[PDB]
Amino acid sequence: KEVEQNSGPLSVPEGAIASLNCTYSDRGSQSFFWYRQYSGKSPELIMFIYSNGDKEDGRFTAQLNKASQYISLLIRDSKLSDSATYLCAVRTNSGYALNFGKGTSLLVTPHIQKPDPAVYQLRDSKSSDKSVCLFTDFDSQTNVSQSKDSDVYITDKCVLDMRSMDFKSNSAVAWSNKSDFACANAFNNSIIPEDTFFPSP
Amino acid sequence: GSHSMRYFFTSVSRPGRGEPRFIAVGYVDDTQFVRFDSDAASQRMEPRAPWIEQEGPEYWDGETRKVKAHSQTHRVDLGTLRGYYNQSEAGSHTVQRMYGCDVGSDWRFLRGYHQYAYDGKDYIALKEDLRSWTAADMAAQTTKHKWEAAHVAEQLRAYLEGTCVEWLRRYLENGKETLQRTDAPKTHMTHHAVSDHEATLRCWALSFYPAEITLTWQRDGEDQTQDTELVETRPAGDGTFQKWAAVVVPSGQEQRYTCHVQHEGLPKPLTLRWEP
Amino acid sequence: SLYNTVATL
Amino acid sequence: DAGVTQSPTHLIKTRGQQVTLRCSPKQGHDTVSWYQQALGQGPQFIFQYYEEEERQRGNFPDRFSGHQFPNYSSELNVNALLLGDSALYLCASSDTVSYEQYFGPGTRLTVTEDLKNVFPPEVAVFEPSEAEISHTQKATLVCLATGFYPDHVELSWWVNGKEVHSGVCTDPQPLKEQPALNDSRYALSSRLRVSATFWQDPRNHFRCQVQFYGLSENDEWTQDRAKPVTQIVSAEAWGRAD
Amino acid sequence: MIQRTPKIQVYSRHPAENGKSNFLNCYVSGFHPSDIEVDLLKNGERIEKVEHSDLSFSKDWSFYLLYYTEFTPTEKDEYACRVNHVTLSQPKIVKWDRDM
């Protein structure tokens, strides 16, 4: 509540300018920092700004305005590795402590060149019974609902980048144990593309 | 007219006998409003003006925190310089630090300053644009190099241009009765004969604020500079000031000599002759 | 008031 | 001559217990600040130490206390642990020239009603369908870590004994196995994708490994199942021919 | 180590009148280093209730202090200011003259 950010998510397509704001209220705020936090990790300082105005650094630009009490951060030419939580932070002239925002979260939506939406069935190394359903190669305009029956787990979407082939790919995973479950009948709470490929189990 | 906020710090090492004597004082114009002294029992920034007492314990925790950081800074600086100059722990050395703001007639930013000395001698300071450092010494330019990489100047410039002005403006409004007061010099003039054939005329200026004043002697139209004995302006103890200026003259020619008194708190400049 | 981030040598 | 360091990386405690986290600044830095970060939220300042004394306090309560030593390392002690003290406790180191603050990894504290609640993951690997390989000339393995508590796991993939990063993506966050419960157990998936031809060479060996952070040796264990200590749990496949 | 010797002035806050209460100031300035010893004397005996200002300094880095005391001037009493510093090879007395 001393320094304020919307949580997001904020979505930006790959290659396009991302923009994040942050506002603060103490007029004696003198020093400003942006930090970046990857899932599971600590914050990393990406830019400090000590003077009113604009500061460019590679792909990153901060804009500070103390009359109006905001700092913007723009990110040019967005990459998939920019997906992260961006934390805004101020040090006041009172002291040496940082006051941090809630953090705004950025997802960079990757672009699929040729969508080939499909649901495949995958079996266990060890036993037969254990079985999983992988919805893959769909395009970035598709959400994936969690189902509403506690026997049937469905992951959120996740994007992998094969850097050798230069290929990108969305995927979600679905599993239950219960007998009354198959890959045609997982992902039914989702809007699956009409053309999605369901090859025999 | 114009106004200033200046802070002054002095650390002085002691051979054994503990840690350095640290003394910090803050002014607005010619009026002290805070102090810290490391040998005082309080261990806190202390008010020294009526109008700063209006601030609460969060302002004071804050000054105490930051003035303690200034004293700790000077302690490691001392130790670092003793190394760069190749000097003993036996010795007793001094660092001094001065910084602040000026504003114009409207309370708007005019100038910022930041200067540091070791023993009595300039060590490193901000240039007037505030983006770069004068360092004449060989040790001083190693300090320059570390502070350029770490953006030390840019951070200072934010305080001096920004929050230093913001706070001077607060203290001026808060303290308006004492700090935007101008006090007229009560002037008088003495005459005791030095010799037969010659006499001292002494021109006095008492009970004035601020301390800026000009006292010159004229003879007919011309000015005595080679011949005037000034003294440095001095505090009365009550927060006003005193100065005099003196000239020796041929006896019987006192009517030829006039004392020109120029000060902010007088409608027009005064001129006194020696009334018989 | 008094600068926070005063730097060492 | 290294960066900021903290230990332990992970911790598990019951309500009312006490805890003492360690942190040491980057060589050349001598100020440490401690912050608390709840999930999805911003770091909250607890306090900062300089020259072995406490330089500034945040707005936390008495049961949070700290020390810094001669070598500049610091301890954060918390007692009367509360469930809501679960957090990333971060340490940040700073010099006194520039005053920029650089964060450590953190100590990740979970405070739970009871230790009986703690479980390691079961890990399984699923092998690509032949349908995906004929349709796209690509091969996706999925790894499933399941029924673990708490949500502090690292999941990596290893191909012929070397960790790999390209073709991986792991879920950002686990999911709850029954969401209704405060103490629910978790699941998490990761996919590794490789070319058909790479998967089809049967001399390539594929491992999904899950580092799980559990109980220390200090803690009590009555139960029949193996004490869920810190451990690695793995599953694997080899490639299969055309 | 740059050594500088002080400039002592001795004077009253208000114009001195015999029998009226006042303050006697001793103002030492222009000196370095800061270890200075300063006494106000009444007929060569040190005065006891002597206060002084916080140490501070001018543009050229040299120090100044104000030393002051409550007193009543009467013809017969002679007041003065005694100062020792490292630059002066013996303490230095400056007598209070009613018109300097």
Author numbering:
A (entry chain D): 2 to 202
B (entry chain A): 1 to 276
C (entry chain C): 1 to 9
D (entry chain E): 1 to 242
E (entry chain B): 0 to 99
Question: What is written in the article reporting this PDB entry?
Answer:
The majority of these studies have focussed on the immunodominant response through the p17 HIV Gag-derived epitope SL9 (amino acids 77–85, sequence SLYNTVATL) (6–23). Instead, in the face of SL9-specific CTL pressure, HIV has been observed to undergo preferred mutation at positions 3, 6, and 8 in the epitope. Here we use structure and protein biophysics to deconstruct how HIV escapes from the well-studied SL9-specific 868 TCR. We add to the existing data by providing the first ever TCR–pMHC structures in this exemplar model of how HIV evades engagement by host TCRs.
To understand how positions 3, 6 and 8 in SL9 impinge on TCR binding, we solved the structure of the wild-type 868 TCR in complex with A2–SLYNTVATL to 2.9 Å resolution. The 868 TCR bound to A2–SLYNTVATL with a conventional, centrally-located, diagonal orientation with the TCR α-chain positioned over the α2 helix of MHC class I and the TCR β-chain positioned over the α1 helix. The TCR crossing angle of 51.6° lies within the normal range for human TCR–pMHC complexes, enabling positioning of the TCR CDR3 loops centrally over the peptide, and the CDR1 and CDR2 loops predominantly over the MHC helices. Closer examination of the interface between the TCR and the pMHC showed that the CDR3 loops almost exclusively made contacts with the peptide, forming a pincer around the solvent-exposed 4N and 5T residues in the peptide. The TCR–peptide interaction included 10 hydrogen bonds and 52 vdW contacts, mainly focussed on 4N. The CDR1 and CDR2 loops primarily contacted the α helices of the MHC, including interactions with all three restriction triad residues (MHC residues 65R, 69A, and 155Q) as well as strong interactions with MHC residues 72Q and 154E. Although most of the TCR–pMHC interactions were focussed on these 2 peptide residues and 5 MHC residues, the 868 TCR bound with a broad footprint, making additional bonds with all but 2 peptide residues (1S and 9L) and a further 14 MHC residues. In total, the 868 TCR made 20 hydrogen bonds, and 121 van der Waals (vdWs) contacts with A2–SLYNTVATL, which is in the higher range compared to previously published viral TCR–pMHC complexes. The 868-A2–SLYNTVATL complex structure demonstrated that the dominant contacts with the SL9 peptide were with the 4N residue rather than with the 3Y, 6V, or 8T residues that result in immune escape when substituted to create the SLFNTIAVL ultimate escape variant. Here, we reproduced SPR-binding assays with the 868 TCR for the three ligands included in this study. These data demonstrated that the 868 TCR bound to A2–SLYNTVATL with a KD of 82 nM confirming that this is, by far, the strongest binding natural TCR–peptide–MHC interaction ever recorded.
